[PDB]
Amino acid sequence: QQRTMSENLRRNLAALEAKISEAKTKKNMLQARAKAAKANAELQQTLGGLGTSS
Amino acid sequence: QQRTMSENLRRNLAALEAKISEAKTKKNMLQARAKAAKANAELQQTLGGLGTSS
């Protein structure tokens, strides 16, 4: 009974490590998309300042 | 999605560079027209002084 529980805990750890590592890499990717969106906001804001100064 | 955004930013840069470079060359041209208008103002002002001294 202890070895069937020991394998069941190994499966629980393997599933948990997979979903944690997936969630962390996807969070880094969406933060890089948000950094690109911030750069497009700066581009439009400086284009507005180029418009009023020109 | 990042490459379609990357091309969209390339289009935004190309349109911005075109309208900035157009506005700067037109501003140099109208400043040269204003320099010619200033020269015609000096010509009429000195013609007035030639009139009163003559």
Curated annotation (Swiss-Prot), chains A, B:
Transmembrane parts of this sequence: none
Phenotype reported upon loss of the gene: Essential, it cannot be completely disrupted. Cells with very low levels of protein have no ordered thylakoids, are barely green and are non-photosynthetic.
Compartments in which it is found: Cell inner membrane
Family in the record: Belongs to the PspA/Vipp/IM30 family.
Function: Required for thylakoid formation.
UniProt protein name: Membrane-associated protein Vipp1
Native source organism of the sequence: Synechocystis sp. (strain ATCC 27184 / PCC 6803 / Kazusa)
Lineage: Bacteria, Bacillati, Cyanobacteriota, Cyanophyceae, Synechococcales
